[PDB]
Amino acid sequence: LLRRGAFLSYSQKIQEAVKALKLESENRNGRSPGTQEMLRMWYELDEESRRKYQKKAAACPDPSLSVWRPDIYFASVSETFETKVDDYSQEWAAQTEKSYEKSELSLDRLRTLLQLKWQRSLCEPGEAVGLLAAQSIGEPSTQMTLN
Amino acid sequence: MDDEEETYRLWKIRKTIMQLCHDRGYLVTQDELDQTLEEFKAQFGDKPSEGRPRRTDLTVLVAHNDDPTDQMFVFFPEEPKVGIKTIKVYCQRMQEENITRALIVVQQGMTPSAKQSLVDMAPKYILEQFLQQELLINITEHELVPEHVVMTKEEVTELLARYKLRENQLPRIQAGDPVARYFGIKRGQVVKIIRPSETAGRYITYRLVQ
């Protein structure tokens, strides 16, 4: 939710037991009397301590369907499908631990069958999805009488 | 009653701008986008209509993170109707300090005469126009609005190369869109849109700012 940057990471954590000392200069161009002091400490006071471009990540990492297309690269599933599979692999490894059946399979292969079911369930090229979404709002729109 | 109302209102439309300059790369420190409306009274004039936070006092300029050769001015104009008379007052303040970009937070509207001569300056002065009305909300907080992020030219060609794609047959956002104007995006720049979906969790789609 909150905001991230290279210098916004620097200012709140290293420069608030430092900027909070007594300097009572004027507001130069609407800035604080201490914001110019922190930009003085940022622009010309350190070089190669710009490593907070990696502390604050330069972006989010992209999804595994934007990078690494889902029909070719295995286990490139959606981010709500990984949470479902990880919740189920946390539950299964607590209920298969004490269940006295065969249990020939483990987590490493349960995940593989769920991820290859995600991969094999991709809509194949040639699906004509436009008339499958022109009819799923066109056949139940004949059942809608006015009561 | 213009003592607490206009103080809260200028605090709000300054917090929106200092959350807007951070969202385009410009240097905004953390303690000055976490103002608590008592820091606005301790650091600014407390009575607006008397003129202690006058419309010459509130102007801020900040620099980009890459190079401080390209900056922007946040101009808060005095009169509620900015005509051509005060579109060329502030360009004299531009030329003396060598900038290219500035934002004018008009209070009740800019004239139809000056909104033509603001776009038709040159590609030299890229000047933007914001009403005070639409800077109380910060529409990039709304939980239906994606994370628009700007995109360099090195990453447009690779996404036109992955899909064997041209710029015509890519979807469009217009430049009068309320969030493309938040980021100040020209014609031609692709924006990357990270949709908080429910079928997936994130869905990257790309749009041209036409």
Added chain:
Amino acid sequence: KELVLNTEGINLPELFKYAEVLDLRRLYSNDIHAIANTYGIEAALRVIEKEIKDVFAVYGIAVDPRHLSLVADYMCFEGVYKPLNRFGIRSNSSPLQQ
């Protein structure tokens, strides 16, 4: 226990000036033209989907969201909110389809 205002008219900047009382992060409307012009086209696309689902679900019908996000991403393809009529077939390319 979430108090929900639910007005019968639409004025977006009338409610923007009530921010310490109304949690304006979670606002909603029916009007796609009052969200495309205030909150953008990329949130006037997560309003088309909910305004189709909350028309079918009054009548008990449930439509899969993968059919609706294909209609919102077609109508908001040109940046504006186009209709699917005789005035949205002018944008098409084939004369033998028009």
Added chain:
Amino acid sequence: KRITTPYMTKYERARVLGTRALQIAMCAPVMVELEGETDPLLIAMKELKARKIPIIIRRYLPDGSYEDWGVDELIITD
């Protein structure tokens, strides 16, 4: 440089088993040992199981690019 689906979709299987069944009919040379059936589709479906259909598929991308997949290369599902 071929990056498409390794699998054979249902429309692929329809056109392959249709043309190959017409490439069994019209007195065309059959390419498997058989038992004496008389329907071209069963022949053309028992040849898909035995990796005998020699067809190349030109999977057009929307640009106009085409990849040349062989029916032998594509993993058919069971």
Added chain:
Amino acid sequence: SGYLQRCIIKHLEGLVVQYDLTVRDSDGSVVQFLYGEDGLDIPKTQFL
């Protein structure tokens, strides 16, 4: 409701799914980059 379905049909007739998994029109125009924001089908998602 012959009219509504007829219009949505003839405005979504072309939108077939391509070998790069992006839904495109009958003129190459990109509508979506993954079909339905995760790329799946409506039948084959029942047991996921």
Added chain:
Amino acid sequence: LRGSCLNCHMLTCPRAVIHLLLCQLRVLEVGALQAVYELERILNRFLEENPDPSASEIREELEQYTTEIVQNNLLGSQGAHVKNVCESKSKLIALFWK
């Protein structure tokens, strides 16, 4: 005929915009579409920096761009069938006739 006259065989439309439409509808025959706003931007700039109704046939600053992005970027004369191109050209011709 309602936009033309018998005395001089020309049309009564202003020639500040006929040159713009001529300059854009030869760009969109190629289908560049980045510069249907750039041509009207440079038309407005060339019309504000010096008013000149004496420019009767052509303008050199419009024609420099519409001979630059047509001679260059010439191989895409067949990728003009995109919805975004025919939408814009039917829009500009309809704004002209109306």
